[PDB]
Amino acid sequence: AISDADLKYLRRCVDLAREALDDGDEPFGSVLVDHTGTTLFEDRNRVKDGDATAHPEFAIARWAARHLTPDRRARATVYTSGEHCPMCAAAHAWVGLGRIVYATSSAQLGGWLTEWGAQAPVATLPINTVAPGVVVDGPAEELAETMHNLYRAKFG
Amino acid sequence: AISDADLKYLRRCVDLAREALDDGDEPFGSVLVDHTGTTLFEDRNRVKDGDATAHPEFAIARWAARHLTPDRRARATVYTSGEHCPMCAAAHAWVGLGRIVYATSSAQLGGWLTEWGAQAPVATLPINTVAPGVVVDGPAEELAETMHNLYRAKFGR
Ligand SMILES: O=c1nc[nH]c(=O)[nH]1
Ligand SMILES: O=c1nc[nH]c(=O)[nH]1
Ligand SMILES: [Zn+2]
Ligand SMILES: [Zn+2]
Question: Which residues form the CMP/dCMP-type deaminase domain (chain A) (predicted)?
Protein backbone atom coordinates (compact mmCIF):
# COMPACT_ATOMS: atom_id res chain seq x y z
CA ALA A 1 0.00 0.00 0.00
CA ILE A 2 1.37 3.35 -1.12
CA SER A 3 -1.46 5.78 -0.45
CA ASP A 4 -1.87 9.28 -1.86
CA ALA A 5 -0.70 10.62 1.52
CA ASP A 6 2.35 8.31 1.33
CA LEU A 7 3.22 9.66 -2.10
CA LYS A 8 3.07 13.27 -0.81
CA TYR A 9 5.69 12.40 1.83
CA LEU A 10 7.79 10.59 -0.73
CA ARG A 11 7.66 13.74 -2.89
CA ARG A 12 9.02 15.68 0.10
CA CYS A 13 11.86 13.11 0.34
CA VAL A 14 12.68 13.73 -3.31
CA ASP A 15 12.77 17.51 -2.64
CA LEU A 16 15.19 16.87 0.24
CA ALA A 17 17.34 14.67 -2.03
CA ARG A 18 17.52 17.53 -4.54
CA GLU A 19 18.45 19.93 -1.70
CA ALA A 20 21.28 17.54 -0.84
CA LEU A 21 22.45 17.38 -4.45
CA ASP A 22 22.37 21.17 -4.81
CA ASP A 23 24.44 21.53 -1.61
CA GLY A 24 27.18 19.18 -2.86
CA ASP A 25 26.00 16.05 -1.03
CA GLU A 26 24.43 12.86 -2.41
CA PRO A 27 20.71 12.79 -3.37
CA PHE A 28 19.00 11.00 -0.46
CA GLY A 29 16.33 12.50 1.83
CA SER A 30 14.06 11.04 4.49
CA VAL A 31 11.24 12.12 6.79
CA LEU A 32 9.93 10.69 10.03
CA VAL A 33 6.16 10.91 10.55
CA ASP A 34 4.15 10.26 13.70
CA HIS A 35 1.08 8.00 13.66
CA THR A 36 -1.00 11.20 13.88
CA GLY A 37 0.60 12.28 10.58
CA THR A 38 2.72 15.04 12.15
CA THR A 39 6.17 15.33 10.60
CA LEU A 40 8.56 14.89 13.55
CA PHE A 41 11.96 15.21 11.83
CA GLU A 42 13.38 15.58 8.30
CA ASP A 43 16.97 15.15 7.06
CA ARG A 44 19.08 14.61 3.99
CA ASN A 45 22.43 13.22 3.09
CA ARG A 46 25.43 15.15 4.49
CA VAL A 47 28.46 13.07 3.45
CA LYS A 48 30.36 15.81 1.59
CA ASP A 49 32.30 16.97 4.64
CA GLY A 50 34.06 13.63 5.05
CA ASP A 51 31.75 11.27 6.97
CA ALA A 52 30.34 8.68 4.61
CA THR A 53 28.00 7.45 7.37
CA ALA A 54 26.01 10.76 7.23
CA HIS A 55 22.90 9.15 5.78
CA PRO A 56 19.53 10.66 6.73
CA GLU A 57 17.79 7.37 7.66
CA PHE A 58 20.56 6.82 10.23
CA ALA A 59 20.08 10.34 11.60
CA ILE A 60 16.37 9.53 11.92
CA ALA A 61 17.12 6.34 13.85
CA ARG A 62 19.33 8.17 16.38
CA TRP A 63 16.82 11.03 16.63
CA ALA A 64 14.02 8.58 17.33
CA ALA A 65 16.11 6.80 19.99
CA ARG A 66 16.68 10.11 21.75
CA HIS A 67 13.26 11.75 21.45
CA LEU A 68 10.59 9.02 21.21
CA THR A 69 9.57 6.22 23.53
CA PRO A 70 9.64 2.71 21.98
CA ASP A 71 5.83 2.68 21.65
CA ARG A 72 5.84 5.89 19.60
CA ARG A 73 8.76 4.68 17.49
CA ALA A 74 6.92 1.49 16.59
CA ARG A 75 3.93 3.54 15.33
CA ALA A 76 6.08 6.04 13.39
CA THR A 77 6.68 5.82 9.63
CA VAL A 78 9.89 6.58 7.82
CA TYR A 79 9.70 7.80 4.22
CA THR A 80 12.86 7.80 2.13
CA SER A 81 13.76 8.71 -1.44
CA GLY A 82 16.01 5.66 -1.62
CA GLU A 83 15.72 2.34 0.16
CA HIS A 84 17.86 2.14 3.32
CA CYS A 85 21.33 0.75 2.80
CA PRO A 86 22.21 -2.06 5.28
CA MET A 87 23.67 0.41 7.75
CA CYS A 88 20.43 2.37 7.94
CA ALA A 89 18.11 -0.65 7.77
CA ALA A 90 19.97 -2.20 10.73
CA ALA A 91 19.88 1.07 12.71
CA HIS A 92 16.15 1.36 12.05
CA ALA A 93 15.48 -2.10 13.40
CA TRP A 94 17.81 -1.69 16.40
CA VAL A 95 15.87 1.37 17.60
CA GLY A 96 12.55 -0.31 16.88
CA LEU A 97 11.08 2.06 14.28
CA GLY A 98 8.01 0.98 12.34
CA ARG A 99 6.98 1.12 8.71
CA ILE A 100 9.39 2.15 5.91
CA VAL A 101 8.19 3.56 2.60
CA TYR A 102 10.75 4.19 -0.14
CA ALA A 103 10.60 5.73 -3.56
CA THR A 104 13.34 3.76 -5.34
CA SER A 105 14.81 0.39 -4.43
CA SER A 106 18.42 -0.20 -3.72
CA ALA A 107 18.29 -2.76 -6.58
CA GLN A 108 17.23 0.08 -8.94
CA LEU A 109 20.06 2.29 -7.75
CA GLY A 110 22.61 -0.51 -7.84
CA GLY A 111 21.64 -1.30 -11.45
CA TRP A 112 22.00 2.37 -12.43
CA LEU A 113 25.32 2.66 -10.55
CA THR A 114 26.51 -0.46 -12.38
CA GLU A 115 25.67 1.23 -15.70
CA TRP A 116 27.91 4.18 -14.59
CA GLY A 117 30.73 2.10 -13.04
CA ALA A 118 30.04 3.64 -9.61
CA GLN A 119 29.31 0.64 -7.40
CA ALA A 120 29.28 1.10 -3.62
CA PRO A 121 31.49 -0.86 -1.16
CA VAL A 122 28.36 -1.98 0.68
CA ALA A 123 26.07 -4.65 -0.78
CA THR A 124 22.62 -3.68 -2.10
CA LEU A 125 20.59 -5.91 0.23
CA PRO A 126 16.81 -5.40 0.47
CA ILE A 127 15.71 -4.01 3.85
CA ASN A 128 14.05 -7.24 4.97
CA THR A 129 17.26 -9.22 4.46
CA VAL A 130 18.84 -6.99 7.13
CA ALA A 131 15.75 -6.26 9.20
CA PRO A 132 13.26 -9.14 8.78
CA GLY A 133 10.45 -7.77 10.97
CA VAL A 134 10.11 -4.30 9.40
CA VAL A 135 7.05 -3.52 7.26
CA VAL A 136 8.39 -2.17 3.95
CA ASP A 137 6.44 -0.55 1.12
CA GLY A 138 8.04 0.54 -2.13
CA PRO A 139 9.18 1.26 -4.70
CA ALA A 140 6.86 4.01 -5.95
CA GLU A 141 7.08 3.39 -9.69
CA GLU A 142 5.91 6.94 -10.53
CA LEU A 143 9.06 8.35 -8.93
CA ALA A 144 11.59 6.15 -10.75
CA GLU A 145 12.54 8.49 -13.57
CA THR A 146 12.64 11.53 -11.25
CA MET A 147 15.04 9.85 -8.84
CA HIS A 148 17.10 8.36 -11.69
CA ASN A 149 17.65 11.93 -12.84
CA LEU A 150 19.02 13.01 -9.44
CA TYR A 151 21.21 9.93 -9.14
CA ARG A 152 22.56 10.50 -12.65
CA ALA A 153 23.40 14.11 -11.78
CA LYS A 154 25.61 12.88 -8.94
CA PHE A 155 26.98 9.52 -10.06
CA GLY A 156 26.58 9.52 -13.86
CA ALA B 1 45.24 -15.87 10.20
CA ILE B 2 45.10 -14.78 13.86
CA SER B 3 48.62 -13.91 15.04
CA ASP B 4 49.83 -13.68 18.66
CA ALA B 5 49.52 -9.87 18.44
CA ASP B 6 46.04 -10.23 17.01
CA LEU B 7 44.99 -12.45 19.90
CA LYS B 8 46.33 -9.92 22.45
CA TYR B 9 44.07 -7.25 20.90
CA LEU B 10 41.10 -9.63 20.94
CA ARG B 11 41.77 -10.25 24.63
CA ARG B 12 41.59 -6.49 25.20
CA CYS B 13 38.27 -6.48 23.37
CA VAL B 14 36.93 -9.13 25.75
CA ASP B 15 38.12 -6.96 28.69
CA LEU B 16 36.18 -4.02 27.17
CA ALA B 17 33.12 -6.23 26.70
CA ARG B 18 33.37 -7.23 30.39
CA GLU B 19 33.58 -3.52 31.35
CA ALA B 20 30.41 -2.92 29.32
CA LEU B 21 28.63 -5.85 30.99
CA ASP B 22 29.57 -4.67 34.45
CA ASP B 23 28.33 -1.15 33.66
CA GLY B 24 24.83 -2.41 32.63
CA ASP B 25 25.47 -2.36 28.88
CA GLU B 26 25.86 -5.31 26.50
CA PRO B 27 29.18 -7.24 26.20
CA PHE B 28 30.80 -5.90 23.04
CA GLY B 29 34.22 -4.28 22.85
CA SER B 30 36.34 -3.02 20.01
CA VAL B 31 39.80 -1.58 19.33
CA LEU B 32 41.21 0.28 16.33
CA VAL B 33 44.94 -0.26 15.74
CA ASP B 34 47.22 1.66 13.39
CA HIS B 35 49.66 -0.09 11.02
CA THR B 36 52.45 0.81 13.50
CA GLY B 37 50.82 -1.26 16.23
CA THR B 38 49.56 1.79 18.19
CA THR B 39 46.03 1.63 19.65
CA LEU B 40 44.17 4.65 18.22
CA PHE B 41 40.75 4.31 19.91
CA GLU B 42 39.06 1.76 22.15
CA ASP B 43 35.32 1.56 22.80
CA ARG B 44 32.58 -0.61 24.11
CA ASN B 45 28.84 -0.94 23.83
CA ARG B 46 26.80 1.89 25.45
CA VAL B 47 23.16 1.02 24.75
CA LYS B 48 21.90 1.28 28.36
CA ASP B 49 21.06 5.00 27.98
CA GLY B 50 18.46 3.95 25.40
CA ASP B 51 20.20 4.21 22.00
CA ALA B 52 20.39 0.70 20.63
CA THR B 53 22.78 1.95 17.93
CA ALA B 54 25.58 2.66 20.48
CA HIS B 55 27.89 -0.10 19.16
CA PRO B 56 31.68 0.33 19.49
CA GLU B 57 32.53 -0.72 15.91
CA PHE B 58 30.29 2.06 14.65
CA ALA B 59 32.00 4.60 16.91
CA ILE B 60 35.29 3.40 15.52
CA ALA B 61 34.05 3.89 11.96
CA ARG B 62 33.12 7.50 12.72
CA TRP B 63 36.40 8.04 14.63
CA ALA B 64 38.29 6.82 11.56
CA ALA B 65 36.29 9.10 9.21
CA ARG B 66 37.07 12.11 11.48
CA HIS B 67 40.77 11.50 12.25
CA LEU B 68 42.34 9.36 9.55
CA THR B 69 43.08 9.89 5.88
CA PRO B 70 41.69 7.17 3.52
CA ASP B 71 45.21 5.67 3.10
CA ARG B 72 45.61 5.35 6.88
CA ARG B 73 42.13 3.86 7.30
CA ALA B 74 42.92 1.18 4.75
CA ARG B 75 46.00 0.17 6.77
CA ALA B 76 44.26 0.18 10.16
CA THR B 77 42.81 -2.92 11.80
CA VAL B 78 39.64 -3.24 13.81
CA TYR B 79 39.48 -5.92 16.48
CA THR B 80 36.13 -6.83 18.03
CA SER B 81 34.89 -9.26 20.64
CA GLY B 82 31.85 -10.01 18.45
CA GLU B 83 31.60 -9.92 14.63
CA HIS B 84 30.13 -6.65 13.36
CA CYS B 85 26.37 -6.53 13.01
CA PRO B 86 25.20 -5.31 9.57
CA MET B 87 24.95 -1.71 10.84
CA CYS B 88 28.60 -1.73 11.87
CA ALA B 89 29.90 -3.81 8.92
CA ALA B 90 28.31 -1.35 6.46
CA ALA B 91 29.67 1.68 8.35
CA HIS B 92 33.17 0.12 8.30
CA ALA B 93 32.95 -0.30 4.52
CA TRP B 94 31.42 3.13 3.91
CA VAL B 95 34.36 4.82 5.62
CA GLY B 96 36.95 2.56 3.93
CA LEU B 97 38.51 0.84 6.96
CA GLY B 98 40.59 -2.27 6.42
CA ARG B 99 40.95 -5.67 8.11
CA ILE B 100 38.51 -6.91 10.75
CA VAL B 101 39.47 -9.55 13.32
CA TYR B 102 36.75 -10.92 15.55
CA ALA B 103 36.75 -13.27 18.52
CA THR B 104 33.28 -14.78 17.99
CA SER B 105 31.09 -14.83 14.91
CA SER B 106 27.59 -13.48 14.67
CA ALA B 107 26.43 -17.02 13.80
CA GLN B 108 27.93 -18.27 17.11
CA LEU B 109 26.11 -15.52 19.01
CA GLY B 110 22.93 -16.09 17.03
CA GLY B 111 22.93 -19.79 17.97
CA TRP B 112 23.46 -18.98 21.62
CA LEU B 113 20.73 -16.27 21.66
CA THR B 114 18.33 -18.83 20.18
CA GLU B 115 19.13 -21.17 23.10
CA TRP B 116 18.00 -18.35 25.45
CA GLY B 117 15.12 -17.02 23.31
CA ALA B 118 16.85 -13.59 22.96
CA GLN B 119 16.90 -13.12 19.13
CA ALA B 120 17.92 -9.68 17.75
CA PRO B 121 15.69 -7.71 15.29
CA VAL B 122 18.69 -7.46 12.96
CA ALA B 123 19.81 -10.48 10.91
CA THR B 124 23.07 -12.26 11.76
CA LEU B 125 24.64 -11.72 8.33
CA PRO B 126 28.34 -12.43 7.93
CA ILE B 127 30.42 -9.29 7.39
CA ASN B 128 31.27 -10.20 3.79
CA THR B 129 27.57 -10.47 2.83
CA VAL B 130 27.25 -6.77 3.82
CA ALA B 131 30.82 -5.57 2.90
CA PRO B 132 32.19 -7.93 0.23
CA GLY B 133 35.64 -6.30 -0.03
CA VAL B 134 36.70 -6.38 3.64
CA VAL B 135 39.34 -8.81 4.82
CA VAL B 136 37.84 -10.68 7.75
CA ASP B 137 39.55 -13.05 10.17
CA GLY B 138 38.04 -15.04 13.00
CA PRO B 139 36.68 -16.49 15.06
CA ALA B 140 39.30 -17.29 17.71
CA GLU B 141 38.67 -20.76 19.13
CA GLU B 142 40.67 -19.80 22.25
CA LEU B 143 38.03 -17.17 23.19
CA ALA B 144 34.84 -19.13 22.36
CA GLU B 145 33.98 -20.23 25.91
CA THR B 146 35.06 -16.88 27.49
CA MET B 147 32.79 -15.00 25.12
CA HIS B 148 29.96 -17.61 25.51
CA ASN B 149 30.02 -16.99 29.27
CA LEU B 150 29.98 -13.18 28.84
CA TYR B 151 27.05 -13.39 26.48
CA ARG B 152 25.31 -15.77 28.89
CA ALA B 153 25.85 -13.19 31.66
CA LYS B 154 23.82 -10.59 29.70
CA PHE B 155 21.33 -12.66 27.67
CA GLY B 156 21.11 -16.05 29.41
CA ARG B 157 18.08 -17.53 31.20
O1 LIG C 1 22.33 8.66 2.27
C2 LIG C 1 22.20 7.49 1.91
N3 LIG C 1 21.09 6.76 2.22
C4 LIG C 1 21.01 5.35 1.70
N5 LIG C 1 22.03 4.87 0.97
C6 LIG C 1 23.08 5.65 0.64
O7 LIG C 1 24.02 5.23 -0.03
N8 LIG C 1 23.24 6.97 1.10
O1 LIG D 1 27.53 -3.43 20.36
C2 LIG D 1 27.27 -4.29 19.49
N3 LIG D 1 28.18 -4.64 18.46
C4 LIG D 1 27.83 -5.61 17.50
N5 LIG D 1 26.59 -6.26 17.56
C6 LIG D 1 25.73 -5.90 18.53
O7 LIG D 1 24.63 -6.45 18.63
N8 LIG D 1 26.07 -4.92 19.48
ZN1 LIG E 1 22.22 4.32 4.58
ZN1 LIG F 1 26.90 -3.30 15.45
Answer: 4-113
